[PDB]
Each structure stands twice: as C-alpha cells, then as structure tokens.
Design a protein around this ligand. Structure first.
Ligand SMILES: Nc1ncnc2c1ncn2[C@@H]1O[C@H](COP(=O)(O)OP(=O)(O)OP(=O)(O)O)[C@@H](O)[C@H]1O
Ligand SMILES: Nc1ncnc2c1ncn2[C@@H]1O[C@H](COP(=O)(O)OP(=O)(O)OP(=O)(O)O)[C@@H](O)[C@H]1O
Ligand SMILES: [Mg+2]
Ligand SMILES: [Mg+2]
Lengths: 239, 39, 241, 31
C-alpha cells in the first residue's frame, strides 16, 4: 500500500511521524520504503544520513542521473529515498524544477506494480505544486497531520484535503484549556478523525537530535507506543 | 480534481449534534471562533 | 518602516506575533497597517473579521477590482489588509495567481512613500513564490521566527533567510533537555538572535480563538509583555528606512 | 538578497556535553 502523510500546515510533525510509522511497520514484520517528497530533505536525518550527503531522487533527476541509484538501505526491511539537497538558487526558484520531476511518478508506479515493498510511505510537503499533486495521485490512502489549535481548526473549514484522508492529531499537550475545548468539539463534529493521537513527548523531540526514528531511539517511549497503535490501525484499514 | 486523477474536498464536518453535550455549549460560549463555524 | 515577518518554517507563530506586534505598536501611538500575504488568509481572524468575509487585496485583484477598497479599519491607528478567500480551485493552482499579483508592490511602495503609516507589517508565507520575494524586497527590515527544536536547528544551517533579518524565538519553555541544549547552543553561535524571546503562553493560544490580538485579549500576559518589549525594540532599532 | 544565517562555532561553555549528547548537534558544530 502507498500511504501519503501531509500536514494540514507546516511544523505539525509529519516528518517525525513518517519515520516513526515506517519503523513501527518494520517491527510488525513489514517491508517499507520511505520517500521524502519535501524539498527541505529532512526525512533522511531521522535515519543517520550524513548532513553532507546530498544525493536523493530529485537531486539525481535534476542532474540527469538515475533516481533509482540514490536510495539507501536502513535495515533489511526499511529502505530510504531522500529528496536530495538543493542549492540556495534552486530553493528560491521552485518553478525551475517543480515541473522537471514528473518521471518520479512513473518510476514509483513501476515500484508499486512490482510489489517489491509492502508499504511505501511518502512524506509530502505543505504546498500545491505539480509534483506534490502527482505523488498524491499514486497514494492509496493519506493521513492529514494536525495539531489541536485554533490555526488547524480554521484550516479544516477552508482548505481541501486528499479525498478519503483521515486526520491524525500530533503534539497533544497538558495545560491548555483551549486545546481541550477544540478537541472535544472535534470528537463530535470531525467525521474523519482517527481514534488515536500522539502526545507531545520528549522522545519525539530528542529522536531527531539522535538521528533515529522514535521507536528505535526509545522503544518503550509513550509516543513510540502511540505510533505502534497507528501502525496496527494502518495494517487493518489501509491494506 | 487534479489530472491518474486526484480529487480534493473539504474535510467532512457535521455540526448537527452539538447542542447535546453541555460541555460543548460552554466551549462555544467562551470561544467566538468555534461558535462562528458551528452555527 | 516596512517590517516583514516570516517563519523559518510553518506553524512557528508568525501570524499571531504579527497581529500582536501590530497591536502593541498602535498601543504605543503608531499608525499601523498590517498586510496578510499568506494565501491561508488567517491574519484577519485575529481582528474579529467574519469568516464568510471573502474580500481581500488578492481576491480583489483576481476578480478585477481595486485592492484599496478591500481594507478594513480595526482602530483609528490600526488598519487591516486581508489576503481574501481563495476558492478550492485557486488554492490547488498556485502558479495561476502567484504571477498576476505583482502590482501590489507598486501599490504598497506608493503607500510607503505617502507616510500615512509609521509601520507596515507584512505577514509573509513560508514559500519562495514570486509575490513573496517581491514583498520581501519592499521590507525595510525582517524577522525570521523560529521555535527551539531540532527541525529549526537544521533549517538554520541549510536554508536562506532574508538578508539582514533577525531571529526571534517563539513558543519557548524551559524543561525539555534537548531544547535547552539547542537554546544554549544558539546563544553562543547564532549571531543574529534577538535579545528577547516569546515564551509559550496559553494567551497566545486563546487569543485567536477569541479573535483578538494577544495584547487586547490579556494585556498582563507574559507573552503580551514580551511583544511590547519587541515593539519597543523595533521603535529603537527598526525605525530607519 | 538571500543568504545563510550567521553562525560561528569557533570556540565551544558546557556545550561540549550537549554536542556529545546529540549527534545532530555535533554534526553542524564540527562541520
Ligand atoms: N509529538 C512530538 N513531541 C515533541 N516534539 C515533537 C513531536 N512531533 C514533532 N516534534 C518535533 O517538532 C519538530 C518538527 O517536527 P517535524 O519535522 O516532524 O514536522 P513537520 O510537519 O515535518 O515540519 P516541516 O514543516 O519542517 O516539514 C521537530 O524538531 C520534531 O522533533
Ligand atoms: N507563544 C505561543 N504560545 C502558545 N501557543 C502559541 C504561541 N504562538 C503561537 N501559538 C499557537 O500556535 C498556532 C500557530 O500559530 P500561528 O498561526 O501564529 O503560526 P504560523 O507560523 O503563522 O502558522 P502558518 O504556517 O499556518 O501560517 C496557533 O494556534 C497559535 O495560537
Ligand atoms: Mg516535514
Ligand atoms: Mg501564518
């Protein structure tokens, strides 16, 4: 199954959850490929990839090379395909390359048809570029990552999500009355809300600094257990 | 509808059953933003 | 003075700080115009603008109308220029309209020259579109807003900020060991860090739900006092053109 | 006018314990 993870806004924890969900699927005995579709190229850093390692699927395409030679093996069950490092000029001119990357959809379509992986997780950026909509079309299911706050609450009433997307709460915290009011409102009104959420957790803040997925960094962390619950739900509902 | 074809829709939100829970009535009372979308 | 505010990433608190800072500046006696350059069109909601109100400077331009009539007055010293509501079709086609909005720069460069406002604050989105870079060129100064975490730590080492920008920490809170390590590292290595930060504060989370800036919502909150310190810093240091 | 932020790790100050604690942080410091 091809699963897209995309934040309803930036910074809600999409990348950390993607790496963690991939680790949990492996722990459940699954073969997983993780693809970084974000030009920030941060997913690789949850997998001990050196910051100076610039290779990636988009870096390869723009250099006229085979994107299939830019993948990395993390474990025997978990492969990683970083986006690649863009130069400052490329970062500040997305219109130069956001249309040159259409071959990745064909390439991921072949990979999907081969059944080489049981799961392909795509970390998708918060934009509406051509390449982002193209990768979303390959997904069989999608998760919309939110935080429970007034910002996300407004966005759910005005911006479109992928069809059939389910909403996943991250960063649930103690000490916020307004968050609890919004959350209780969501429990009665948001039809596509997932029955489990992820709390704010020190392990989720440290695992990126240790360059590991949270399940590998602290297997008994509460957030690691919450992600494992999500992985079990995906096995049952997103197969 | 992006053209494989990927369609985009607003999140499925249903506010019909709000008035049941009294705790939701107090939350809508305090926060005008939530009451604005609810009604 | 035209001040741009931009998050180093999304969701760091850029819009809330903009609305709060504009309130503190008009509190200090300045005539302020606040402009939302984010297609999310969220800044207006901190000033009690109805969600159904679709009018905005971008919405007007795309509908063949005058953008100057899309303004709203909050107080006698604080005016609001919302972006306007984009249809779902427009949202998923950014290239269609991100190129037709270049005229707002001349309309703002004229307003900058007239001097009707002492401060023009622009809430800038986290992208690299043409209109975003154009508005950034109109700014006299800029603030790059971050949260203390590993994500922002990486971004500060690989992505470009507006030249001459200062870094402003938001949502800070002592307790997390890794965040304190990052914070101590930033104090000794980030040359352009601002001497004041904004702590996490439930008033900052509630004010948007009350559709007010944090200073009007709760003037004695710690974050409101911190925004006032920032407003005094801009008057002393960001006044020149 | 876009450039990278001004950062100097010239001399590193109990940050040595932080750099040994977090490989991500030591990566940018030694670089
Ligand atoms: N549940 C959590 N508890 C604590 N820290 C978290 C949690 N989720 C994410 N973080 C931290 O928040 C920061 C942002 O997370 P992450 O990079 O996964 O988000 P994102 O939505 O992918 O951001 P971006 O817009 O840059 O892509 C990181 O430093 C991460 O370690
Ligand atoms: N200092 C703070 N303490 C607590 N909550 C905060 C703080 N700053 C912002 N928030 C909350 O975080 C959420 C995001 O804030 P905001 O909308 O200002 O961020 P942003 O960077 O503009 O987001 P976006 O990427 O959507 O434009 C809001 O619910 C806001 O109330
Ligand atoms: Mg991300
Ligand atoms: Mg904003």
């Amino acid at each position: 199954a091809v699963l897209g993870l995309q934040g309803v806004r930036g910074g809600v924890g999409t990348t950390t959850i993607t790496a963690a969900l991939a680790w949990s699927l492996q722990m459940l005995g699954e073969n997983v490929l993780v693809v970084d579709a974000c030009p920030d190229n941060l997913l690789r850093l949850s997998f001990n990839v050196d910051f100076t390692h610039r290779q990636g699927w988009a870096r390869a395409m723009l250099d006229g090379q085979d994107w299939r030679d830019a993948g990395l093996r993390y474990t025997s069950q978990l492969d990683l395909l970083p986006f690649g490092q863009l130069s400052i000029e490329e970062q500040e001119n997305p219109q130069h390359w956001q249309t040159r990357l259409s071959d990745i959809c064909s390439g991921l379509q072949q990979l999907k048809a081969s059944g080489r992986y049981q799961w392909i997780l795509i970390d998708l950026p918060r934009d509406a570029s051509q390449i982002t909509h193209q990768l979303l079309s390959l997904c069989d299911h999608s998760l919309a990552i939110v935080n429970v706050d007034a910002n996300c609450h407004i966005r759910l009433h005005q911006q479109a999500l992928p069809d059939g997307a389910h909403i996943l709460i991250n960063n649930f915290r103690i000490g916020s009355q307004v968050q609890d009011d919004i959350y209780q409102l969501w429990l009665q009104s948001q039809r596509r809300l997932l029955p489990m959420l992820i709390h704010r957790d020190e392990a989720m803040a440290e695992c990126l600094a240790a360059k590991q997925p949270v399940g590998e960094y602290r297997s008994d962390a509460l957030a690691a257990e919450e992600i494992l619950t999500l992985a079990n739900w995906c096995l049952l509902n997103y197969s | 509808i992006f053209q494989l074809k990927q369609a985009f829709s607003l999140p499925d939100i249903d506010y019909a059953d709000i008035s049941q829970r009294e705790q939701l009535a107090a939350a809508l009372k305090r926060w005008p933003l939530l009451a604005e979308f609810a009604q």
